[PDB]
Scaffold this active site. Structure first.
Site, PDB file in Angstrom:
ATOM      1  N   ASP A  10       0.883  -1.159   0.000  1.00  0.00           N
ATOM      2  CA  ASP A  10       0.000   0.000   0.000  1.00  0.00           C
ATOM      3  C   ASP A  10       0.913   1.199   0.000  1.00  0.00           C
ATOM      4  O   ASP A  10       1.552   1.454   0.999  1.00  0.00           O
ATOM      5  CB  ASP A  10      -0.881  -0.034   1.243  1.00  0.00           C
ATOM      6  CG  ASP A  10      -1.728   1.216   1.412  1.00  0.00           C
ATOM      7  OD1 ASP A  10      -1.797   2.057   0.485  1.00  0.00           O
ATOM      8  OD2 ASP A  10      -2.310   1.334   2.494  1.00  0.00           O
ATOM      9  N   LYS A  70       2.421  11.344  -3.751  1.00  0.00           N
ATOM     10  CA  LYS A  70       1.409  10.596  -4.477  1.00  0.00           C
ATOM     11  C   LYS A  70       0.492  11.568  -5.233  1.00  0.00           C
ATOM     12  O   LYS A  70      -0.050  11.225  -6.281  1.00  0.00           O
ATOM     13  CB  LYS A  70       0.626   9.705  -3.520  1.00  0.00           C
ATOM     14  CG  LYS A  70      -0.343   8.725  -4.186  1.00  0.00           C
ATOM     15  CD  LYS A  70      -0.966   7.809  -3.138  1.00  0.00           C
ATOM     16  CE  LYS A  70      -2.025   6.906  -3.718  1.00  0.00           C
ATOM     17  NZ  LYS A  70      -2.426   5.956  -2.634  1.00  0.00           N
ATOM     18  N   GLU A 152      -7.198   0.178  -4.402  1.00  0.00           N
ATOM     19  CA  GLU A 152      -7.219   0.112  -2.941  1.00  0.00           C
ATOM     20  C   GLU A 152      -8.536  -0.477  -2.363  1.00  0.00           C
ATOM     21  O   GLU A 152      -8.476  -1.335  -1.459  1.00  0.00           O
ATOM     22  CB  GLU A 152      -6.897   1.484  -2.333  1.00  0.00           C
ATOM     23  CG  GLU A 152      -5.405   1.847  -2.488  1.00  0.00           C
ATOM     24  CD  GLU A 152      -5.106   3.314  -2.511  1.00  0.00           C
ATOM     25  OE1 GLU A 152      -5.928   4.107  -2.005  1.00  0.00           O
ATOM     26  OE2 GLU A 152      -4.016   3.674  -3.051  1.00  0.00           O
ATOM     27  N   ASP A 175     -12.981   5.352   2.973  1.00  0.00           N
ATOM     28  CA  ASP A 175     -11.530   5.364   3.125  1.00  0.00           C
ATOM     29  C   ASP A 175     -11.096   6.752   3.554  1.00  0.00           C
ATOM     30  O   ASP A 175     -10.972   7.656   2.732  1.00  0.00           O
ATOM     31  CB  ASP A 175     -10.835   4.939   1.805  1.00  0.00           C
ATOM     32  CG  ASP A 175      -9.351   4.815   1.942  1.00  0.00           C
ATOM     33  OD1 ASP A 175      -8.763   5.475   2.839  1.00  0.00           O
ATOM     34  OD2 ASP A 175      -8.757   3.989   1.145  1.00  0.00           O
TER      35      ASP A 175
END
Length: 370
Positions: A10, A70, A152, A175
């Site tokens: 992850d 990211k 994810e 999330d």
């Protein structure tokens, strides 16, 4: 040419996690400071790249620290670091991301006692080809054959074994990461996952809840020390951020917490010591606007998927901040009747899923029963 282990990674905006199949079960691997997740932070000094917990700590003194890389993945944006000789080095998001991956890989090898050259890396469901390919490239730079990029929320569902369900399932994944919030609706049928809809807020995450606690402490400081403001004091601010994180975590278990910052600065009058109580009720009041912003993306995904909320079979919670009791209550309010699942550590569930996918790709049929 390798038929070896495929680690699950992850690669998060805020934190990263690495897991592997071991004896038919996924195992989350600790980094060298004993931590089961690692900050997605890279810092740069002369002839030295520092990743993770140490890079975060050194932010106070190193302006050449790269956070939230990211966010730039899939773009031709560069980040800049300033060398000691005054020149500037330009880095791609791929190269920075690779340092994170390289660090995970390095400690995983030492844990497993084996060289590792294969990974599954997770990405957000909304990532396009450019963003996916950037991630693959970061893996390649780190010496990993990236066997598959998977979403994810799909990884989370894999961790809970939802692909094995006896009937078609619709799954909501909520999330709440460190800096971003994502909602996904998945359809799972005959072993395959389909993303039905996604929504979110890329400027809403656990850090924002922390920042309210920082603001609360800062108000108190000003009130008790004649307007004193430490916003420009990087070490003080680092300690406040750390204090806020701790306070938030404790308030997920208890109804109150004590923020304790001895010797936070020294003024002409003398040392400044902060000792301050924060209740869960007050913490919830301060952050209610942030929490309420998570409601709209749920309604949006339901709308986009053209379903009734009663059509959602199962809810998964991902991200450490979903441990907040107010989050559970919000989600329950929006999907009546259903239990928000967090029995798999929400900080780890995505890496666990990636590790499961690794075993699948390897055709590893070893079970704990054997």
């Amino acid at each position: 040419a390798d038929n070896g282990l495929i680690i699950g990674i992850d690669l998060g905006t805020t934190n990263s996690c690495v897991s592997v199949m071991e004896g038919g079960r996924p195992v989350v691997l600790e980094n060298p400071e004993g931590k089961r997740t690692t900050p997605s932070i890279v810092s740069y000094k002369n002839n030295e790249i520092i990743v993770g917990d140490a890079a975060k700590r050194q932010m106070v003194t190193n302006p050449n620290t790269i956070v939230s890389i990211k966010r730039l993945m899939g773009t031709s944006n560069k980040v800049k670091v300033q060398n000691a000789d005054g020149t500037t080095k330009e880095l791609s998001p791929e190269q920075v991301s690779a340092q994170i991956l390289s660090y995970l890989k390095d400690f995983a090898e030492k844990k497993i006692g084996k060289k590792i050259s294969r990974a599954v890396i997770t990405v957000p469901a909304y990532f396009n080809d450019a963003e996916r390919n950037a991630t693959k490239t970061a893996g390649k730079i780190a010496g990993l054959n990236v066997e598959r990029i998977i979403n994810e929320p799909t990884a989370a569902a894999l961790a809970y074994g939802i692909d094995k369900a006896s009937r078609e399932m619709k799954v909501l994944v909520y999330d709440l990461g460190g800096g971003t919030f994502d909602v996904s609706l998945l359809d799972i049928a005959e072993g395959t996952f389909e993303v039905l809809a996604t929504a979110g807020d890329n400027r809403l995450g656990g850090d924002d809840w922390d920042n309210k606690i920082i603001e609360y402490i800062s108000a108190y400081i000003a009130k008790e020390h004649q307007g004193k403001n430490l916003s420009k004091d990087k070490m003080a601010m680092q300690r406040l951020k750390e204090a806020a994180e701790r306070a938030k975590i404790e308030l997920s278990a208890q109804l109150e917490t004590i923020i304790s910052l001895p010797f936070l600065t020294v003024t002409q009058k003398g040392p400044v010591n902060v000792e301050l109580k924060l209740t869960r009720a007050k913490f919830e009041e301060l952050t209610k606007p942030l929490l309420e912003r998570t409601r709209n993306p749920i309604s949006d995904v339901i709308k986009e998927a053209k379903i009734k909320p009663e059509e959602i079979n199962e809810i998964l919670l991902v991200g450490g901040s979903t441990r907040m009791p107010a989050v559970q209550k919000l989600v329950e309010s929006m999907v009546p009747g259903k239990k928000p699942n967090r029995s798999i550590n929400p900080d780890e569930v995505v890496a666990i899923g990636a590790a499961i996918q690794g075993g699948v790709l390897r055709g590893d049929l070893e079970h704990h029963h054997h």
